[PDB]
Ligand SMILES: Nc1nc2c(ncn2[C@@H]2O[C@H](COP(=O)(O)OP(=O)(O)OP(=O)(O)O)[C@@H](O)[C@H]2O)c(=O)[nH]1
Ligand SMILES: Nc1nc2c(ncn2[C@@H]2O[C@H](COP(=O)(O)OP(=O)(O)O)[C@@H](O)[C@H]2O)c(=O)[nH]1
Ligand SMILES: CNc1nc(N2CCCc3cc(OC)ccc32)c2cc(F)ccc2n1
Ligand SMILES: [Ca+2]
């Protein structure tokens with residue numbers, strides 16, 4: 004057994020965390036009660052990675068639901084599948100975070116945090132071999148951003164030798180008008196660079212543009228966006244949840260994908276939104292990236308691809324060999340064989356062949372540059388500093404997160420520019 | 425000639441031994457420098473995570489200087 | 492006596508042990524429950540196959556082997572597979588967390604947690620031995636367990652068994668089957684850490700084996716099960732001299748005299764023939780001279796290199812099956828005139844020949860044709876140093892940007908171990924140059 008401990012926080016955190024559990028429950032053959040009505044035993048082989056086994060043959064998500072307002076918490080169990088969760092593992096506040104990061108990190112989240120920590124430990128100590136954690140949250144919603152990054156900091160203090168894998172949702176003025184989101188995200192990133200091993204950048208700008216342009220949804224709902232995210236999220240865990248040639252776990256992914264501890268922000272991709280050449284073509288196409296970044300604007304440090312479906316893998320071998328050949332100037336030459344692929348037989352519900360694409364591209368600096376621009380438009384003005392400096396923070400705490408993220412892109416640009424000879 | 429016959433067999437023993445020795449010591453040296461090293465690293469990670477809790481004290485104490 | 496204990500480390504080592512020990516059983520007529528109808532010496536004997544199998548009083552023949560992996564996936568398949576009955580549980584040693592493709596975790600972090608248990612199990616095997624000869628260590632270069640734990644074990648074996656012989660079967664990494672971008676790092680580290688502790692190491696290049704399967708068996712996309720079944724045939728040829736009796740049979744240790752001219756130059760190049768499919772072998776019978784020629788076609792080597800653009804310091808032919816020396820001698824004489832076989836100037840050019848009459852076996856439902864006769868050539872050629880150049884080049888590309896080196900340092904290693912390892916490899920490559928230079 005290799006147990007990941009799941010953790011949803013804040014508004015966006017809990018919602019994208021719910022559809023995750025729905026989708027993999029369905030793939031693994033598990034109904035909203037927690038019993039197994041599935042065809043193939045391949046759906047149980049690695050079932051303990053995300054699922055506590057309960058007598059009566061009931062499987063309980065190893066999940067910790069968290070928020071500083073009980074609204075989101077109620078909608079969860081009311082939602083589809085709400086009754087497969089462990090009732091103890093809900094941990095709600097009351098006051099709320101009010102889209103302030105200082106409220107989630109230092110003050111109001113700080114009080115609720117030790118109660119969450121208690122729930123982590125109980126589930127952790129029940130693990131034969133703890134991989135580590137994955138946290139779903141957003142980087143604009145005060146609870147997910149500030150408390151999430153505080154809960155990371157605290158979990159790392161107590162499990163410094165476990166992997167910290169987060170799904171972070173990036174604010175886009177095309178999806179939320181709330182003015183202080185460049186502040187929240189930048190303060191979260193200052194933390195994510197230092198205390199996570201692997202972060203999938205789930206960009207709302209990229210989810211919006213996708214639904215608008217490719218899906219032609221004139222006005223898309225947080226339910227249309229989050230439809231993208233569950234297909235993404237189901238992809239980048241397929242090698243955790245199912246057997247394969249490789250013994251995929253959260254640490255082997257970090258070792259192979261993170262050439263430098265700070266450059267651990269991944270660009271995810273999904274296809275289709277077909278023939279093996281088209282998946283491969285699309286899955287490297289900027290239009291299928293779940294981060295608003297062009298790969299052809301930087302270079303790939305490392306890449307991992309998951310082919311789901313029933314396909315001639317010899318074809319996939321040549322197809323993936325084709326893309327690197329024809330796109331060689333877009334993969335750093337100083338990391339040999341930096342493109343790996345796995346192939347799973349079970350496709351998600353509804354597609355006969357998907358492909359999922361994880362990419363450490365130096366073009367992610369594109370995403371961080373956007374947020375660094377929205378930030379400085381405010382900080383040059385000192386706008387809204389009272390929501391934070393009132394909660395006790397210094398101004399140099401904003402300057403420091405700003406120079407930290409500035410550096411993170413300098414470094415992405417340093418390795419895009421680097422050459423072998 | 426017998427004196428030399430026993431020097432050779434004594435040299436083979438001497439060397440087979442000095443080899444088992446330098447191995448045994450090279451390992452223990454490596455394993456020790458490794459324990460030190462790996463620990464120094466985990467202690468560094470905590471000393472800085474813990475300076476994060478001292479800055480959560482300073483931050484909260486500033487907001488009590490607000491009332 | 493003259494017993495050999497086999498140690499199978501990590502995924503590749505353990506699965507190749509499966510291939511090998513299933514093949515041995517089929518060669519010696521041992522059933523999956525360990526019983527051997529032909530052995531009338533019950534509970535023991537000093538027959539040749541006893542060098543690899545001990546016998547219980549109840550008639551079971553038990554591999555003198557130990558499987559070690561830092562996680563349980565791969566060894567659990569043994570514990571429940573067709574040959575589960577062959578192995579006493581104590582022989583199958585697993586941990587909980589693997590090395591996560593990290594030499595450091597394999598060698599230090601995770602691996603320090605299990606080494607004593609492993610050496611204790613190895614000792615329980617050595618203690619059954621009336622005249623233990625040495626160890627056969629199967630492992631990958633690429634994996635974190637394969638590389639880091641193997642070398643920890645090798646260091647420790649040198650301490651507990653002094654100069655007693657340690658041979659290696661080492662899987663050299665290939666992009667077509669690689670599992671990790673870091674396999675060059677693990678490769679250089681374990682090669683350096685082990686060089687002093689190994690007496691002879693037979694390298695298997697996964698791309699060589701992959702190509703051979705694709706060309707000669709046409710498997711479109713060969714599996715580990717495809718590769719391992721061919722590896723086991725080459726392993727079986729090298730060990731056939733220890734497990735089988737024979738008038739014309741040459742002990743493997745006698746070939747080692749010729750194969751190792753200096754302690755660091757101990758990497759022989761293996762080449763095997765014929766590897767042919769059932770359909771392509773039907774009605775087509777391959778002569779002693781045909782299979783012998785195959786040995787000098789570079790596309791049949793276990794390692795990709797050009798012996799034609801290097802020099803030989805040794806050349807051995809291990810034949811099994813329907814082969815007599817007259818044929819052999821004829822075949823060699825033709826090849827000598829018609830092929831590019833240049834020896835260094837300091838060693839004789841003769842070919843050392845062994846013949847085991849027991850014909851090769853195939854595994855049920857395998858893709859290899861069952862042939863009447865087969866050969867494995869073992870040559871010491873400077874050409875093998877090409878494989879070190881390739882690997883050394885990949886190492887350098889990443890180590891100049893220090894890519895991934897933090898995962899090693901965070902586990903307790905120092906950059907100095909990397910440069911110390913690489914420098915050893917650089918000297919190894921220069922040693923291979925020096926030996927081929929002419930005398931003065
Ligand atoms: N020929 C062959 N090679 C294999 C096999 N399994 C793994 N390998 C090779 O081994 C290399 C990786 O090392 P592994 O043995 O899989 O890893 P490990 O020894 O279990 O060590 P860990 O990292 O802790 O898992 C890859 O380059 C593979 O090509 C196999 O069954 N047959
Ligand atoms: N993609 C996506 N983004 C969301 C969702 N809900 C909220 N967000 C984003 O998260 C930010 C607000 O964070 P929020 O979840 O409300 O924080 P919370 O109230 O403490 O949980 C906004 O910028 C939204 O764009 C969702 O369901 N999907
Ligand atoms: C847990 N997620 C995960 N991990 C993977 N690993 C671990 C195993 C070695 C590995 C080496 C890599 O070299 C660049 C990249 C990635 C990976 C992985 C690999 C795939 F080819 C496809 C999907 C994957 N998904
Ligand atoms: Ca007997």
Ligand SMILES: [Mg+2]
Pocket residue numbers: 250501502562589590634636
């Ligand atoms: Mg393993």
